[PDB]
């Protein structure tokens, strides 16, 4: 009876399997943003997250990824073009596991995203929350240990596989 999609990332450390993280996507609250992430996880539009890396990881903050075009952390594109408007700001950054959109100002949402590892209320109203870690948060915690204070990672944290579970 209408159920929020569930997608997974199989995380790899320099090609070594680390573990699976699954996300609920709040299609009920933000349909356009949830669908962007869902389809980039399946690649069903011809492009998506598979093979991309988490290029900025700041312990105590978040794990950022989603640039599958240039891979340097400046690229990425949505399924609607290269950017789409801020759908809404209903859902908040309530704690670890929150899935939020990175941007460069209002209405500049692309494909880059971050997984919060803490409460980040000072992001409310500027970045669109669209999902939340369902399971595998212990895997996200391990990814955090490869980060640094400026986000540089000490190994290649890549999305070795991704897709949809539900």
């Amino acid at each position: 009876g209408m159920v929020n999609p569930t997608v997974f990332f199989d995380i790899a450390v320099d090609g070594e399997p680390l573990g699976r993280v699954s996300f609920e996507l709040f299609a009920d609250k933000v349909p356009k943003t949830a669908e962007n992430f869902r389809a980039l996880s399946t690649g069903e539009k011809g492009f998506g997250y598979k093979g991309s890396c988490f290029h900025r990881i700041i312990p105590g903050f978040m794990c950022q990824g989603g640039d599958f075009t240039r891979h340097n952390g400046t690229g990425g594109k949505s399924i609607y073009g290269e950017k789409f408007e801020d759908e809404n700001f209903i859902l908040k950054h309530t704690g670890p596991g929150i899935l939020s959109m990175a941007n460069a100002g209002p209405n500049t949402n692309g494909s880059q995203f971050f997984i919060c590892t803490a409460k980040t209320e000072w992001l409310d109203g500027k970045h669109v929350v669209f999902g939340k870690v369902k399971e595998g948060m212990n895997i996200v915690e391990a990814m955090e240990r490869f980060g640094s204070r400026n986000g540089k990672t000490s190994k290649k944290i890549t999305i070795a596989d991704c897709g949809q579970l539900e």
Binding site: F61, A102, A104
Partner: peptide, 11 residues
């Protein structure tokens, strides 16, 4: 700019 990094930096 990366607004969430700049927010983290200001905080």
């Amino acid at each position: 700019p990366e607004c969430h990094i700049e927010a983290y930096w200001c905080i």
